[PDB]
Amino acid sequence: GYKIILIGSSGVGKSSIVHQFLFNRKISNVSPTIGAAFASKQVIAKNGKTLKLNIWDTAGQERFRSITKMYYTNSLGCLVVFDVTDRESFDDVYYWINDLRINCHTTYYILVVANKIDIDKNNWRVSENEIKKFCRDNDCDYVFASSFESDTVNNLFGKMIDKMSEIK
Ligand SMILES: Nc1nc2c(ncn2[C@@H]2O[C@H](COP(=O)(O)OP(=O)(O)O)[C@@H](O)[C@H]2O)c(=O)[nH]1
Ligand SMILES: [Mg+2]
Numbered sequence: 001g002y003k004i005i006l007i008g009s010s011g012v013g014k015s016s017i018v019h020q021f022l023f024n025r026k027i028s029n030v031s032p033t034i035g036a037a038f039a040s041k042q043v044i045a046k047n048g049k050t051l052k053l054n055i056w057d058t059a060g061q062e063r064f065r066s067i068t069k070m071y072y073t074n075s076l077g078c079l080v081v082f083d084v085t086d087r088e089s090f091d092d093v094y095y096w097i098n099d100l101r102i103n104c105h106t107t108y109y110i111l112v113v114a115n116k117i118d119i120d121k122n123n124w125r126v127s128e129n130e131i132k133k134f135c136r137d138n139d140c141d142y143v144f145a146s147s148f149e150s151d152t153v154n155n156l157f158g159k160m161i162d163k164m165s166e167i168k
Contacts, residue, residue: 045161113144
């Protein structure tokens with residue numbers, strides 16, 4: 001299968017994005033087990049390739065900046081999530097992408113997710129122009145999302161699935 005990992009600072013919505021993609025709702029009393037994938041999902045890409053996605057989510061250990069080698073290793077895709085209203089979580093994106101790249105050299109596609117767009121724009125602390133510039137300077141892609149807007153979650157996983165489907 002294809003290992004896809006979620007990274008990003010605490011509380012940005014990593015688990016909620018995963019639950020929306022897998023369950024169309026938040027399951028309130030389930031959390032990932034350390035050292036293993038949270039869930040796998042069979043998908044059919046636009047090109048008709050069938051892919052087994054193996055989705056890794058943290059169990060809260062990102063609060064300590066303590067993601068292990070084995071969490072990162074063998075990843076083919078990575079979603080780097082931040083919260084548009086949380087400036088520190090955006091500033092951390094640089095750290096997270098660097099940490100991924102020192103621990104894993106197999107990542108084919110890195111997608112920055114600017115999450116929580118459901119919140120009033122008066123509370124946003126980052127502009128699209130800054131996100132565009134950061135992703136240009138750091139060789140990654142970006143999308144806007146909200147875990148409460150199913151279309152945005154389908155869009156971000158769709159971009160990831162289509163990139164994974166191109167791997168030979
Ligand atoms: N307003 C808003 N809240 C969100 C969104 N995604 C997640 N949350 C909330 O933010 C809190 C932390 O989310 P969680 O998924 O546990 O973040 P994680 O620490 O990155 O895994 C929870 O109360 C979520 O329901 C979003 O898109 N918009
Ligand atoms: Mg979480």
